[PDB]
Amino acid sequence: DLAVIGFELDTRFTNTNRRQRGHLLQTRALQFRHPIPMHAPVTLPMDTM
Amino acid sequence: NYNEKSQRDFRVVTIGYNLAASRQDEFAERIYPTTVI
């Protein structure tokens, strides 16, 4: 029974028309907020006079 | 408001994202040199 019985082709469409979209590609943005704290003081006392 | 310390009017800095990559990477280019057809 030595014979070729079937085949498969590595065929693709030429997308002159937008038949397929493929993968999507979109823009995103993230926000990070960093408020600045105030720290405890250090003091140098002086005589007012 | 005895203490008026900035809470919302922060500096906004935009991080860049656009890139102009060079066709296939230098790794692929050294292996598969590009010929313009």
Side-chain angles (χ1 to χ4, degrees):
Chain A
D1 62 358
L2 180 64
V4 176
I5 62 170
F7 64 98
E8 296 174 356
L9 306 175
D10 193 20
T11 299
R12 62 185 67 189
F13 288 95
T14 299
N15 293 278
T16 299
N17 57 311
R18 299 292 181 88
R19 173 62 70 192
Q20 298 291 334
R21 298 179 71 190
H23 280 306
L24 301 177
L25 187 67
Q26 294 188 30
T27 300
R28 294 288 185 271
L30 303 172
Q31 296 181 2
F32 304 80
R33 186 177 292 276
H34 304 289
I36 297 168
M38 184 174 285
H39 304 272
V42 57
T43 299
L44 190 146
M46 296 179 74
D47 193 318
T48 60
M49 297 178 285
Chain B
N1 293 330
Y2 179 76
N3 184 59
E4 181 65 55
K5 182 167 178 285
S6 177
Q7 185 177 9
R8 68 181 177 85
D9 191 16
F10 289 179
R11 181 177 294 176
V12 178
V13 55
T14 299
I15 299 163
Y17 65 109
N18 292 306
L19 177 67
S22 178
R23 289 171 180 170
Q24 70 183 345
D25 191 271
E26 185 172 359
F27 176 80
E29 183 63 21
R30 182 68 177 83
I31 297 168
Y32 297 94
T34 299
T35 299
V36 177
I37 305 300

